[PDB]
């Protein structure tokens, strides 16, 4: 089979400016007419892959000028002349010289921006939840960048763990920011028995850490 | 809209078996060889099959991984391809995409369906409204709706019956819970303060799996 392997495996860039892929292929892909046997593809997360070249160089239908695809034989480059924040996304490129078709691992392009401290949102359990027997407290981190936060569970002051789940957003279109949802889930029994539930964060932006908090039955 | 559309796919036993279908909307499949391509969720892209046109005689090519347990068809005259997987297996877990090539006429990529292997049956989400009990940002409320406890973890989406300028609804990815094979998220609707006062109401809408959909009411603090 066909390798294919791209670098970097994660970029950063700010709006306006360059970006570049390099892949490589284990075989040549040049093609007797002068053109080569790789496509190049962008993928939001959960949505199929997009069409962005084929053919080494082909710009396919409605793919956006900035992008061009470039290289021969074994080596091929994507650029992007001017990021935009919609350009966020794992770009992969893809060999069609054979079956099996093969895939390079995928870069993951971010867009750059100043650091931004996260707003933190706590939620208690809601009161229809509780009946049901499972008490879920919410953690919500807003407008924050670069994407590492770090969130800690403490109930009445013992840290939590093996019990809590995260997930973090795409940038926003506007401002380029992640959000966080952590979710500290517990049985009704066990939520009932403890008075104090905090949420803290950390994070590059944050000089302090941030702590929310809620006495049980006060919300 | 021109497209592939995928069906079929959801949950099935391991051992059991399960046919996928790609049917073309608004183009001819005639003209393509039809590929399978799959992605295990947070990973790369993977060959599974491919099946020439009619002209070359409906030639069949399947991945090393899945060769035995393949056949893949075409029905020209419904404009659908399909992908039969038999003896399927824990890490054929996957989304699966139907993917077109050869014909200069027509480059399409199916939507993608998921694929589980799995002895569970489905669960719905559990959706609760929620309330901010720390403080809200200047001149904005912030709402939000729990989505809990829910699998297969796509797909999955929710909507809120605010938007436009101001508003901004957040949408985090399924996380697996801790304890129990289901996986949880949430959804939050940040808009300005006057769209969101006392006695005001406003709901999140949750579509999950093939199931019907979930509208719940949240209020406004
Ligand atoms: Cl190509
Ligand atoms: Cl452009
Ligand atoms: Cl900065
Ligand atoms: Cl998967
Ligand atoms: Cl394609």
């Known amino acids: 089979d066909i390798v294919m392997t791209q670098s970097p495996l994660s970029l950063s860039v700010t709006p306006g400016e360059p970006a570049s892929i390099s892949c490589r292929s284990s075989?040549?892909?040049?093609?007797?007419?002068?053109?080569?046997?790789l496509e190049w593809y962008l993928q939001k997360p959960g949505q199929s892959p997009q069409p962005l070249i084929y053919?080494?160089?082909t710009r396919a239908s409605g793919v956006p000028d900035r992008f061009s695809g470039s290289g021969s034989g074994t080596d091929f480059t994507l650029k992007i002349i001017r990021v935009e924040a919609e350009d966020a996304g794992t770009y992969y490129c893809?060999?069609?010289?054979?079956?099996?078709?093969?895939f390079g691992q995928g870069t993951r392009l971010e867009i750059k921006r100043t650091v931004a401290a996260p707003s933190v949102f706590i939620f208690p359990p809601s009161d229809e939840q509780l009946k049901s027997g499972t008490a879920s407290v919410v953690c919500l981190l807003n407008n924050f960048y670069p994407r590492e936060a770090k969130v800690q569970w403490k109930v009445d002051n013992a840290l939590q763990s093996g019990n809590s789940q995260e997930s973090v957003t795409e940038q926003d279109s506007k401002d380029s920011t992640y959000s966080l949802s952590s979710t500290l889930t517990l049985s009704k029994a066990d939520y009932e028995k403890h008075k104090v539930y905090a949420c803290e964060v950390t994070h590059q932006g944050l000089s302090s850490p941030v702590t929310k908090s809620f006495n049980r039955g006060e919300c | 809209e021109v497209q592939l559309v995928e069906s079929g796919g959801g949950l099935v036993q391991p051992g059991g078996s399960l046919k996928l279908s790609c049917a073309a909307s608004?183009?001819?499949?005639?003209?393509?060889?039809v590929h399978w391509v799959r992605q295990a969720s947070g990973k790369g892209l993977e060959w599974v099959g491919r099946?020439?046109?009619?002209?070359?005689?409906?030639?069949?090519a399947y991945a090393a991984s899945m060769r035995g347990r393949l056949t893949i068809s075409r029905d020209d005259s419904k404009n659908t391809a399909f992908l039969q997987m038999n003896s399927l297996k824990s890490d054929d877990t996957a989304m699966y995409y139907c993917?077109?090539?050869?014909?200069?006429?027509?480059?399409?990529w199916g939507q993608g369906t998921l694929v589980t292997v799995s002895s569970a049956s489905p669960t719905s989400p559990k959706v609760f409204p929620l309330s901010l009990c720390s403080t809200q940002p200047d001149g904005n409320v912030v709402i939000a709706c729990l989505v809990q406890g829910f699998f297969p973890q796509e797909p999955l989406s929710v909507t809120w019956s605010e938007s436009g300028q101001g508003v901004t609804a957040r949408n985090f990815p399924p996380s697996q819970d801790a304890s129990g094979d289901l996986y949880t998220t949430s959804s939050q609707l940040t808009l300005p303060a006057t769209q969101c006062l006392a006695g005001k109401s406003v709901t999140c809408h949750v579509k999950h799996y093939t199931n019907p959909s979930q509208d719940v009411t949240v209020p406004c603090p």
């Open positions: 053919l080494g160089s």
């Open positions: 993917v077109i090539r050869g014909d200069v006429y027509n480059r399409q």
């Open positions: 893809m060999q069609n010289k054979q079956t099996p078709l093969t």
């Open positions: 099946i020439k046109r009619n002209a070359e005689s409906d030639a069949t």
């Open positions: 075989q040549s892909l040049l093609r007797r007419d002068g053109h080569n046997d």
């Open positions: 608004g183009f001819t499949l005639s003209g393509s060889n």
